Amino acid sequence: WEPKIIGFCCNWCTYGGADTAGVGRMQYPPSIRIIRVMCSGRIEPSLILKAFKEGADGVFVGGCHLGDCHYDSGNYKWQRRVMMLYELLEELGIEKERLNHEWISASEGEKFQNTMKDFYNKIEALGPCKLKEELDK
Amino acid sequence: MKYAFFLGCIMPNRYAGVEAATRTVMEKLGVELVDMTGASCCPAPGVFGSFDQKTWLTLAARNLCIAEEMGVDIVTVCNGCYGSLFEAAHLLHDNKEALNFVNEKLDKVGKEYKGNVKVRHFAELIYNDIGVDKIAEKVERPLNINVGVHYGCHFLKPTDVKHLGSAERPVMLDEIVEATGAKSVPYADKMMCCGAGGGVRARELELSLDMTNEKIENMIKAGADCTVNVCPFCHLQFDRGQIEIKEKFGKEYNFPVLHLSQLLGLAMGMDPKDLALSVHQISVDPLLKKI
Amino acid sequence: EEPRIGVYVCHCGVNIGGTVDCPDVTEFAKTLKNVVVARDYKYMCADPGQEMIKKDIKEHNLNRVVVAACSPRLHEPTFRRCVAEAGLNPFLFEFANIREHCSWVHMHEKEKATEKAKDLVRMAVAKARLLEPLEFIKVGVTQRALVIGGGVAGIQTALDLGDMGFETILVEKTPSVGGRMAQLDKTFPTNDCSICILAPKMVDVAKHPNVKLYAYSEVVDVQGYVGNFKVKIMKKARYIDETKCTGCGQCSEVCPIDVPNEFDMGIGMRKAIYKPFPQAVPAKYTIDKEHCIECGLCAKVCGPNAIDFDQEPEIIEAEVGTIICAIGYDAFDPTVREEYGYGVYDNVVTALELERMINASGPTGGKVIRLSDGQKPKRIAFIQCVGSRDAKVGNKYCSNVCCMYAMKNSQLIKEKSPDTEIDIYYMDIRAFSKGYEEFYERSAKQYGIKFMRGRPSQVIEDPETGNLVVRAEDTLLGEILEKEYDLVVLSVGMVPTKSADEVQKILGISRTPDQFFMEAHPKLRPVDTATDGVYLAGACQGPKDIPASVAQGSAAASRAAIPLAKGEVEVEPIIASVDAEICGGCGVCVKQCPYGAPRLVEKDGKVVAEVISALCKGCGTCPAGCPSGALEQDHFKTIQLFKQIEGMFRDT
Amino acid sequence: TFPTNDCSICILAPKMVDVAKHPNVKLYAYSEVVDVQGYVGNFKVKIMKKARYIDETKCTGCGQCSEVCPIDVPNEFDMGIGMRKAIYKPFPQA
Amino acid sequence: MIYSSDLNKNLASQIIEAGTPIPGDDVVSSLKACYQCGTCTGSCPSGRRTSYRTRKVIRKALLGMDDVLDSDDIWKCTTCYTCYERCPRDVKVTEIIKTIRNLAAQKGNMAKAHKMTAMYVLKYGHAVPANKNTAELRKSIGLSEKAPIAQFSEKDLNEMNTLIKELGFDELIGFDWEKGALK
Amino acid sequence: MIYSSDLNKNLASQIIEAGTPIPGDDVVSSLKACYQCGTCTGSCPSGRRTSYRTRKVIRKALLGMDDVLDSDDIWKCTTCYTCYERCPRDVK
Ligand SMILES: Cc1cc2nc3c(=O)[nH]c(=O)nc-3n(C[C@H](O)[C@H](O)[C@H](O)COP(=O)(O)OP(=O)(O)OC[C@H]3O[C@@H](n4cnc5c(N)ncnc54)[C@H](O)[C@@H]3O)c2cc1C
Ligand SMILES: C[C@@H](OP(=O)(O)O)[C@H](NC(=O)CCCCCCS)C(=O)O
Ligand code: SF4
């Protein structure tokens, strides 16, 4: 079994950080699949919960550093949403640690690499999230 | 503050006066000092890390298991023990393959390291947690002497894990010994090795003594009346080395050598004899004359 | 119509095919719903690849195209133009990133990388099915340019733009234009007087009919998009009347505050009222209100009474079409490398302090003197790679110019004092451009300059004399050197300038791992940014010498002139819009936008929200926060992202 | 190509495509300037457009012809390593 | 003269694997980042009075010269960590020298005085065991005449002897258990 | 160890002056063009069987180590002229 991880990255800095890790051949585990959005402010609770419903073992979200948002303040809305979302996932019996949000600039290819490594190992240690098979009855 | 007191080897078995000095010095600063029953060689990281890296960590993790099962953090008086145990705790917390290897070994002795032990050096513990003001308030007899501070290598370094500030230009021990009323004198190549670490004293004795003699020269040439250390190996190397230096090189300095706990001891109104200063192979009496 | 998708999986030579099983990905793509054509080719962006796509679009009547290849940040425009040439709307195209995001990061797990590429194709096909035809938005381009930074690179861009007949604004933060080139004494490899060749350019830009120079000014706000920028320039108060003041400087004497003269890197002190350097353009004096104690003694000596503390900063609002960032760089602070002793020993100096010491207009009158006793140093050691090629300080890059400037000033010292011994402690001599290797040979054969291959381990000061011992292994001998010097010069590297953070947030541009500003691509677009209508020039883009900055200055002028000359660009219609039949006028969305695009209006005798398409940049925050779902940003609808999340686990 | 390790085709080939169909660029391939007279703003240049012996307007570039050619030629684009036909196109993305 | 036949292509990879998982794969593989600047050599206090050149040790490893494992000079490092502090390429030199010393010890190039020190910890639990001068001095000072250390607790000495075999450390030093002496 | 006091800063200039006018100022001052590539040492037949490293002799001169003049190694050069032929810096 390998973790199924879903990623949401903003077009401007974090997507540039993932590109930088690829340009530098910075290896990291192949669990995640990344979905592009223009801004992390585009990310909302519905997208995260939708991913867990479909079978996500982990969900990663990356945006610009706070203050460096290409659209000025999109990340601040997202940061408020994700702090609520952490504890909502606990009330649903989903481990807080299965959701991970990070601030990654286009220069931070190395940081993105280790974030991908640390998040993989965390989810791999947690084992699969069993929601999709509980709902399938 | 309650701390498991790791003794090591040199201080308990050869320079016990430092053990007596430390127990009282920290007694008054307000720390209950617990014994770690059955603690062994830490083991010395320079010698044993060089012999077998696996053996160093396994035996080191074991001494840490003693303290966590006591539910208590370690404080040590020696850079050698501080480095070995601090780096062991850090490596086991940070590298899970190293931790698996160790517990598969500690399993055969009914032990398992789980990561709760913090390793602390008594000088750093004095600076960060107690406060250097509480060192000055307690000076019964001020020591207005010039002191050649020897930090030792395994105190500050590696800085990437110790997080004790600069290893090139530290102030931590200088402010401590100046709180006793003494003056920390600058000298050439202050942060250099004493020569004894890494197994060199045992294998290449005069190689180590060439480096200690370099240090001593720079200290006296800067007007130091004595040297102060935070490590028994530095102590023995500076102390017993001077006997040896005289016998083999012909250099005689009569340069007094003190561990910091002993020097703080005098600040607290301690008796020369409970410091076992007579046990020093170079007489400190020229220092006691000036104080 | 039902989607008919063509999927194209590139090998990128071997960059993808070497790790991802591209044939096996194309076979998998054919099993997906609505995929009617699937091919893998070595270079999708090459002519045979683009002709392949377009031939399939026409012969198979494709209404969607998926390319699984590199990042869209590289070639999304390329393929949007490709599919639009075959008739397909540019926004029925979806990009799957299987190189940067897969093949290049999973080289040791080929089986999983191949499986991953299949998932990334399926997630792309999923979103592709719900993509809709969008119309690019044509906007007029304002026939004016803005250049931020008045160094040799920004000056070059303004002169080029001005000479083309484009109105151009040049904003310089300090009192004078000129940049660090104005601080240099000479310039390798010709040893031209730096100020003497640059000053005619500074003169030209101040006199240019199409260039408005705002010295002692800063850009404080940028709004809008390419061709439609609205910018605010704060003309800071000198507290001196430009019209009523001579520039003679008879008010400094009546000043009790001495201030670090930053133009001389702090070696000499300047007064509260000052002129940066004699050749300054504009040649008008300034008062630093930060260190001003407002005791008014200067005002009593001042004749014209040009001194007015009431003077207020004036904000300029100006519409420009393109912006060029050229704010330069700063010298690395070598205090962190404590073993070298900077800030601790008197006779350790940076190379940029040296430039000011050697320069005739400098504080020392062009005389190299030790800062401990003022004597001339007879033995001088240069230490290379200080703050560069050094993971311990976080700067793992090469600063590009330090090898050459260290040999340069070694030549200039030898010329003023032949008997000076000069040693250069280096790792690689990087004399890489035309005349540089010759300059390197000349330094050794003609000027007798010595080269020690060995990065110094530490500098030790003799407290008696103030002299310095440098300790290094002569790696070309296998022996440890311990030579004594009277002055040690640290060949410090280049770091971004202090205000690069402020500028970065205002323009909305990224940074490379070296902390300098990020070009769109090092070879495709070396002076563009991923922010349309914003360009780079000079050392703010990365360490480089004067000819390189000038070339980028001109390059950025050409690139910035394209939209101005076209007079019309196209922006992305990925904007938010409100569905009036679902909007109940909650009011949540109006405060979310930093540009105030969503607004509360009354429609059909009731309150709904409505977004001004012109003020929306397409971040997608307000649609994500909308409770009713009335808000949606095209090309990023919740239903499209929903299908993309399903695509990871299953087809649809 | 260093230091990104893109393929050269990644960066160059789209530029080669754009240049060939640009409305303001007349491309004279297999051509050489043979004379330039005059001065700034007033140059009169002569271009020798060499003969390919294939009507380019009618040419498809499929490459069927190269297969039949009965002779071999040292291919200069491959620096004398690979051998081409006398009927040729320099490299597959030309 | 040096030929290909005199060089070992796997020397660097051998050193790396010996350092895995202790002190770490990434720690010891840093040797491959060294660019021969010599800052380590200039910092070495041992190098200022011997033929020991820290940089040359790293160099010979990368080049494949096995005679490093037999050299006396790798044993003059005091592990001061100064090079470790100053290396501009993040080479964990001090850990690399210790790993190289492990392979040197497994090659039989271990000093007798070093073999002794290892025996003292194996036998008494301590590299520096207690004397009777230790008793009578600690007697004069007011301390427990014997320290609460493993030396006077063979429960812990049981534990250490246990681990040493499991690690093969006694056969590395060539120690025999019943005669209680080295071979 | 090598300190300033054991070095002679002017050794290279002595060698140059000793070579004027024979075999020539420009001939011997070519010593200052050496950039320590080691092509000479690889070509030297004497170096293939002794500790003699041609490049080190040039190096020791530029740095100022007078013990070159007392060394046996300068006398192991057979004057074959091979390094002269191949030196990329025209060092005579
Ligand atoms: C010691 C040393 C020696 C050198 N010697 C040479 C040499 O001999 N030859 C050579 O070719 N190169 C040399 N260089 C490199 C050379 O200095 C640069 O190539 C050159 O300065 C680049 O010019 P620039 O305009 O890109 O940046 P800069 O010269 O730094 O100019 C940037 C300008 O923008 C202004 N600015 C900064 N921030 C803002 C803001 N927020 N708003 C508005 N304006 C702003 C600055 O005041 C400055 O005027 C040397 C560098 C150093 C450090
Ligand atoms: C053995 C010991 O001699 P003594 O038995 O104490 O006389 C001395 N040092 C050592 O080797 C002790 C082992 C290393 C301990 C240092 C750890 S800080 C030596 O051999 O010169
Ligand atoms: S660039 Fe994008 S497309 Fe052109 S080749 Fe390299 S990958 Fe395939």
Ligand code: SF4
């Ligand atoms: S003094 Fe009055 S006038 Fe002479 S300069 Fe300063 S301001 Fe302009």
Ligand code: SF4
């Ligand atoms: S006022 Fe501020 S500035 Fe004018 S003088 Fe007194 S101080 Fe110097």
Ligand code: SF4
């Ligand atoms: S340039 Fe010469 S010096 Fe400046 S960095 Fe690259 S190398 Fe070190």
Ligand code: SF4
């Ligand atoms: S939020 Fe959704 S609903 Fe409430 S207003 Fe803005 S749009 Fe109409």
Ligand code: SF4
């Ligand atoms: S989307 Fe981002 S930008 Fe377009 S409006 Fe809602 S917020 Fe302002």
Ligand code: SF4
């Ligand atoms: S054959 Fe050779 S030439 Fe005739 S068309 Fe096909 S390609 Fe152009």
Ligand code: SF4
């Ligand atoms: S320093 Fe780091 S790099 Fe320079 S040599 Fe010693 S090791 Fe190789």
Ligand code: SF4
């Ligand atoms: S560590 Fe071993 S090597 Fe690195 S310096 Fe201290 S001693 Fe010289």
Ligand code: SF4
């Ligand atoms: S060759 Fe010419 S340059 Fe290369 S070393 Fe021998 S001499 Fe110096």
Ligand code: SF4
């Ligand atoms: S010449 Fe003297 S030196 Fe140059 S190679 Fe022949 S021998 Fe070696």
Ligand SMILES: O=S(=O)(O)CCS
């Ligand atoms: O000798 S060791 O390097 O192992 C410890 C130094 S205190």
Ligand code: FES
């Ligand atoms: S654009 Fe990346 S967080 Fe808003």
Ligand SMILES: [Fe+3]
């Ligand atoms: Fe002039």
